[PDB]
């Protein structure tokens, strides 16, 4: 939301100094002259910058800062002196930074100078190349700092590389003149023997390594995984790396960004990846709800190649319909709250299917109308208004 708004119009400036922001058509000196979208993005950027301050100075020290502010205010709140002490209930920026420096011993003045006083987000364009001879991974990260909403980042940058030997984090120093970052790569001895490949968490899984390159061990790369800067990343992986990142990652933002990047690769391996995500309980439900729409877009792009039925129909009849009647939907029992959301989002994406004539097929429209006719809600303890409203959608 904030990178869309700041690249759209100028930027949000937390803590201006009194104009400080002349790129935008109102004055930021008073709350009653702000646009309402600017007020909403102001609150949004403020809580993300506080998450960044928690990233630099750990969460227990952050809660100690907040407790110190509240305790000064509550010793202030019981005095009777007319504001000799009642102004300890008012916080400022300098007092907040001083309380942070009191509890931690680190000051955050570079982070405050970059993300508060400066009003911009950063844009990262990354592309890699694997050097087989020296066994290194040559990243190439360049910033677009000449757009109207952007600024230049010179700090450190975390990158997480999943190779066959596991998941390794690397810190890159991205100075102004930097372009190529050579990080080292590990072995490929988990392709010699079939062993399980260890993940970002402690677990390990069986991966189908037939799509991987023979010479490179690395399975996927993620630039800034923890969202530790206010950034927009445009990484150029290969399509099998996006499919491996969709399947076997233990991070929901990486599964979402792989869904978002698989729309450019309409190959049938990506259809298999999104269909395996859709069938998979123990995936987070908002990833499967995105995979519905991604599968609809991919299915629209590979018409005159699609083999069987329309997308997600057989999957809908496998998950939510009767075993004896495929075209009759099961009676509504909405007590699971994840297959309820997936059931009410799957025909909405299924209706975006189009034939070679650019008209929605009469197999999906008839399916949606049979979902509407055979709807029986006399048996669940929950209402049907959102599911029926999504059927109209």
């Amino acid at each position: 939301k904030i990178v869309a708004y700041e690249l759209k119009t100028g930027g949000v400036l937390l803590h201006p100094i009194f104009n400080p922001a002349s790129h935008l058509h109102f004055s930021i000196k008073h709350p009653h002259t702000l646009s309402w979208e600017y007020y909403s993005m102001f609150q949004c950027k403020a809580h993300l910058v506080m998450r960044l301050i928690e990233n630099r100075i750990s969460m227990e020290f952050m809660l100690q800062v907040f407790n110190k502010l509240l305790s000064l205010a509550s010793t202030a709140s019981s005095q009777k002196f007319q504001s000799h002490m009642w102004s300890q209930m008012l916080v400022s920026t300098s007092g907040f930074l001083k309380s942070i420096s009191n509890v931690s011993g680190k000051d955050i003045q570079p982070l405050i100078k970059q993300w508060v006083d400066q009003s911009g987000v950063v844009k990262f364009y990354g592309s890699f190349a694997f050097n087989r001879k020296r066994n290194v991974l040559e990243l190439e990260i360049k910033q677009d700092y000449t757009s109207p909403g952007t600024q230049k980042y010179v700090g450190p940058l975390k990158v997480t590389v999943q190779e066959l030997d596991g998941s390794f984090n690397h810190t890159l120093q991205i100075e102004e003149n930097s372009l190529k970052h050579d990080i080292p790569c590990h072995s490929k001895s988990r392709r010699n023997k079939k062993k399980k490949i260890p993940l970002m968490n402690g677990e390990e899984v069986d991966m189908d390594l037939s799509a991987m390159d023979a010479d490179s061990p690395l399975l996927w790369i993620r630039i800034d995984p923890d969202m530790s800067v206010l950034r927009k990343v445009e990484f150029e992986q290969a399509d099998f790396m996006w499919q491996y990142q969709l399947r076997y990652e233990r991070d929901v933002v990486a599964q979402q960004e792989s869904i978002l990047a698989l729309e450019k690769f309409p190959t049938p391996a990506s259809r298999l990846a999104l269909t395996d995500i859709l069938e998979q309980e123990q995936c987070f439900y908002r990833v499967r709800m995105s995979a519905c729409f991604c599968l609809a877009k991919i299915a629209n792009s590979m018409v005159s190649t699609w083999t069987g039925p329309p997308a997600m129909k057989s999957l809908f009849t496998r998950m939510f319909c009767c075993k004896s009647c495929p075209n009759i939907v099961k009676t509504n029992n909405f007590m699971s709250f994840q297959s309820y959301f997936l059931q009410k989002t799957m025909p909405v994406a299924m209706a975006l299917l189009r034939d070679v004539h650019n008209l929605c097929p009469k197999e999906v429209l008839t399916f949606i109308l049979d979902l509407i006719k055979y709807n029986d809600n006399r048996k669940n303890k929950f209402s049907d208004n959102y599911y029926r409203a999504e059927m109209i959608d």
Binding site: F128, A129, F130, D213, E236, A238, D239, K264, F265, T267
Partner: protein, 394 residues
Amino acid sequence: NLQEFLGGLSPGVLDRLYGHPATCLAVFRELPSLAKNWVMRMLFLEQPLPQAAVALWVKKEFSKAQEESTGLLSGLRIWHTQLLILNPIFRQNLRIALLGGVPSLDKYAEERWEVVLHFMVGSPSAAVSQDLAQLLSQAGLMKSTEPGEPPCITSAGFQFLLLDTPAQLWYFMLQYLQTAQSRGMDLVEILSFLFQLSFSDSLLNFLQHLREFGLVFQRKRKSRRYYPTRLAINQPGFIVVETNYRLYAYTESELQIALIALFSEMLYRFPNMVVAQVTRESVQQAIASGITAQQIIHFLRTRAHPVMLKQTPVLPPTITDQIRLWELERDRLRFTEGVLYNQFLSQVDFELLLAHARELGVLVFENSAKRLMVVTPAGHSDVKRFWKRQKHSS
């Protein structure tokens, strides 16, 4: 073949090459079967005729002969559709060609070719001729790299050596013509003389080279008249092969003994016989030098003593199979120049890039499973631009 040589020519050189004296007859004799008949038919016609008649003028059976003859003579451009009348110049020359307008020599040719082959091989005693040496060096079968030291023999040299005399001489003359064009000698004038044989400064030099090769011999202190030898127009065996890789060759000329020693170990040399052994060492030595088992087998078969001709096959299966297996035992490294890309993103997009390097001729190896295309540095400035254009198209 001569058909290949003449097919590899332009119309402008072809019509000029169709000289009055002989060319119209020498090229006629090339016509394998039927095109002779059609040439005779429409030798007397001044009016072109429709192609359908020629098409239907051969029965349904054996039509492939009709199409192949028509294609061959279309390549030779003997006629033109003109809408199939023959070329007027060829018609006139052919009408003028059709009722219009030694024992010591063969030995000389044999001896001259034998001494030429002796020089080709590392024979201490051989005929000396700087022009012949440089001609053989530039023919592609010899490389010197050091004028002071005598030139060595390249890999193609051994293969050329093991060929039979007819094909050997024919290929040598083909290379002679190809290098004649490079050195600037007119190709048509020299070529017409070869055709005239089977019935200027450049002419004198060419005849001198032919005499050095032994095809012709003036015999009169280099007079205008010449008496071509048998080889100019265009024998029993002596080797006996045992089942224990033993060769008994009734050879008196050192050339045959040298040729056998090229791929066999010599044991004894009698006045009218020589004993050699075909061992792994000798055979693999020849293979490394460049020969392949096919040349050795063909050489032994062609120089097969009459005694072993009765048995079928002439060459024992054990010897032939052993030679072939010995050659197979060796498989060898290669050399090329290339550059490789990576991170090709979409699959259907990588298939379009494969056709760019294949049409230009800079593609070496492709990989659709990993997306891995090797591009030679000679055309690197053209593939990258195409890739950039594709990216721009998105």
